[PDB]
Chain A
Amino acid sequence: MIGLVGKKVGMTRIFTEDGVSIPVTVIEVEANRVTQVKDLANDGYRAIQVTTGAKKANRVTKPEAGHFAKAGVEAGRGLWEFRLAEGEEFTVGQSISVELFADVKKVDVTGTSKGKGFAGTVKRWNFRTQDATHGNSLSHRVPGSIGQNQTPGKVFKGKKMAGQMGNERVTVQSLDVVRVDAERNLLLVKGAVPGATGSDLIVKPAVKA
């Protein structure tokens, strides 16, 4: 039960003798609740959220209209939530970047793992000896040549092969927070945070339990 917002770089607040403050600026721009359901045709609690400056002018159509269900300003892609006993379409339909969730506690984040595109053994593991120079036979990077001889085998499904890469979830978990400036939308963490300015992140309280 919380909001999502574009990462957008990261910096620190190099304390005099510290720099402990190593957060990552995560402009937490409020959401737009009003959208949710219960047991009358749907799942559980839930809560839609949308925040960004989508050109309401031209780009997305049906969604803008889909947003007319007593909402305000259609942003980018909408995400959901769950229980927490929040407000609803009965008072406003406009969350904020702060409430009762507390403070100073740790807040996990889930950027979008980049993706170095296709990657290999050496790549998706960082482990596989050999040389290069007097080699030129098994020139290091090879899978390193994996499998059997004459064996049932099945190449053993799931064995770490090359594989590719690309935008993927992540979830860091933990990560305390050094600051926050509501309205101004300026949440800070402590390094980490997946993605690279081109993400979204969910920034949930802390499913530590």
Chain B
Amino acid sequence: SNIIKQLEQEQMKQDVPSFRPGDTVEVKVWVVEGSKKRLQAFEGVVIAIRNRGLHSAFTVRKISNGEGVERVFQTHSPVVDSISVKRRGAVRKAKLYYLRERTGKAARIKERLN
């Protein structure tokens, strides 16, 4: 299966993720969502970022929201949320990826790295 089963993993991510996110991107990655009866709608979740660049299904990037109370969406890469497109918080990743320091406060995940 040089290029056969490992083949679907490829014939689907042909997308244009972010290719380079340095945390804190508080974007609502418009996520298709759904709602019922009508509405297709599309809304997202403000981010922080820590992922896993893996197994085709780049099922990750626990986006981290503090809206009112507490925590994460492990929003994959594969099709139903109209791209991560927006990266607003530049970078400055502490011990880089896997910056899981769940503790809400004046302890910014200081962004900015230009």
Give the interface of B toward A (CB within 8 A). Answer: 1, 5, 8-9, 12, 32, 34, 56-57, 59, 76, 78-80
Contacts and interface: CB of A to CB of B under 8 A. Distances in A.
Nearest to A184: B4
Interface in A75-93: none
A11 interface: yes
Main DSSP-derived SS at the A contact region: loop
A14 interface: yes
Given A14-B76, A19-B78, A8 B1 contact: yes
Contact of B80 (A11, A13, A16): A16
B79 A11 contact: no
Contacts of B79: 14-17
A56 to B, nearest CB: 23
Interface string A1-26: 00000001101111111110000010
B80 A25 contact: no
B5 A9 contact: yes
Contact of A14 (B1, B5, B32, B57): B57
Contact of A11 (B5, B34, B78): B5
B34 A14 contact: no
In order of increasing CB-CB distance, the 8 nearest A-B pairs are A16-B79, A17-B80, A16-B80, A14-B78, A25-B5, A14-B57, A17-B32, A9-B5
A95 B44 CA distance: 51
Interface-centre pick from B5, B8, B12, B80 (highest chain A CB count, 10 A): B8
